[PDB]
Amino acid sequence: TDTTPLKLSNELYAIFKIHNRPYLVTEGDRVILPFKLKQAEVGDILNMTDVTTLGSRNYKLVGHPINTSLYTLKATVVGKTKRAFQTREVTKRRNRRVRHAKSKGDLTILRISELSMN
């Protein structure tokens, strides 16, 4: 795998997958995972492993999952949080009972700190 053009390029993107959910990122990008991370606390660093695609403007390395040796991709866990609280009402059409389906899903804000060809 001649990975020289990617290595050379100033701009570079990745399409890493957490639980088969793809997230297309550059360095500085701020990923918002739609679940509560249990393993990592806030401040902890995540070394991304299942990286599908690593792309320049005109080239892209692709692997499933690209060789871990070829690249780096460090995310930082920058705040577990939640979505806004919502209460949709559930009811049938001639029935006074109206069940409130309250919802407030969890989020985990990552920040892609490092992304480079090793």
């Binding site: 500085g28 792309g55 949080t81 979505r83 700190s113």
Partner: protein, 138 residues
């Protein structure tokens, strides 16, 4: 001839040095007031010390007031969460405190489907153009 446009930089907290979002937490209780029992117990019982030991970048203020028991956090962005912990047991209070410390200070917000990544960066590949496409349309 070339001229500058005065413009300012955007801080990405994570990339260089991570500054921890939660900066200060205030435990507020009442000596009277049966709603403040679990808070009082928490303050008493060696959990707060352990917490402070764990997180020495957060300062833990402990205040007494007449009203309900309060957990007000204070974040780097300047926002302030305040959770009323009325009638909660010790463990519930601790969970609430954990939740607060976990939070990045930002306001709660509805996200649309797949609104995942938030970039300041211009696209690595360009924006599409019909004149510059690989397959020309008809």
């Amino acid at each position: 001839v070339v001229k500058a446009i005065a413009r300012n930089s955007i801080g990405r907290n994570g990339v260089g040095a991570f500054v921890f979002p939660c900066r200060k937490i205030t435990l507020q209780f009442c000596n009277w007031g049966g709603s403040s029992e679990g808070m009082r117990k928490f303050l008493t019982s060696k959990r707060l010390d352990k917490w402070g030991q764990e997180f020495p970048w957060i300062q833990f203020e402990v205040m007494r007031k007449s009203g309900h028991p309060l957990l007000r956090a204070e974040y780097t962005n300047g926002r302030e969460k305040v959770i009323c912990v009325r009638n909660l047991n010790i463990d519930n209070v601790e969970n609430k405190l954990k939740l607060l410390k976990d939070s990045d200070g930002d306001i709660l917000r509805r996200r649309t489907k797949n609104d995942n990544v938030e970039s300041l960066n211009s696209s690595v590949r360009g924006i599409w153009s019909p004149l510059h496409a690989a397959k020309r349309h008809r």
